[PDB]
Design a protein around this ligand. Sequence first.
Ligand SMILES: O[C@@H]1[C@@H](O)[C@H](O[C@@H]2CO[C@@H](O[C@@H]3CO[C@@H](O[C@@H]4CO[C@@H](O[C@@H]5CO[C@@H](O)[C@H](O)[C@H]5O)[C@H](O)[C@H]4O)[C@H](O)[C@H]3O)[C@H](O)[C@H]2O)OC[C@H]1O
Ligand SMILES: [Ca+2]
Ligand SMILES: [Ca+2]
Length: 167
Amino acid sequence: MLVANINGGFESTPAGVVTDLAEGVEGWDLNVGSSVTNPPVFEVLETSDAPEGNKVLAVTVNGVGNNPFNIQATALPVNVRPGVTYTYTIRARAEQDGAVVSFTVGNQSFDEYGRLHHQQITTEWQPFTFEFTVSDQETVIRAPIHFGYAANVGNTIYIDGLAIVDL
Ligand SMILES: O[C@@H]1[C@@H](O)[C@H](O[C@@H]2CO[C@@H](O[C@@H]3CO[C@@H](O[C@@H]4CO[C@@H](O[C@@H]5CO[C@@H](O)[C@H](O)[C@H]5O)[C@H](O)[C@H]4O)[C@H](O)[C@H]3O)[C@H](O)[C@H]2O)OC[C@H]1O
Ligand SMILES: [Ca+2]
Ligand SMILES: [Ca+2]
């Protein structure tokens, strides 16, 4: 397979709670803003339920901040070419009903090329997919997933199998 992103299925990362948010997960930047006074738990889980490989990322939300991105997992680097159109695909589910996630892609100036907005995550694995075009001259971009929605408090959201593919 060919993908723009790195370690899209967390298969590179040792199982366990992630405390090193910026660099503990190859291919990813995890970020919790200081406005999040009850911080989440990020965990790489080894599980037979994994859509891809043996591992998933789990995000347990115990509170939120001011903006959905104050709890986020961002794929970086994402290696792309100007003008090219890409397909984004990921799988997600949640421990409980009611979860909300936005799946986005943007440049280092935080301008979004596209997103899936307030996706309704269920207790069953589902694919979430969209297309975007790199409409500027960037070659290295990023893919922020936003979890800091108030509706997610008391839930755990699981993601796996991020694949950004040359359409
Ligand atoms: O520590 C640092 C981090 O702070 C930094 O995080 C990045 C900050 O920038 C973030 O990007 C912003 C995300 O919010 C976007 O605005 C959204 C766009 O979507 C609008 O919703 C639309 C509603 O209609 C739908 O049809 C449509 O699909 C939706 O888009 C929504 O109302 C807006 O609020 C801003 O445009 C972005 O700039 C980025 O995600 C973070 O990763 O990262 C660096 C780190 O050092
Ligand atoms: Ca996986
Ligand atoms: Ca990183």
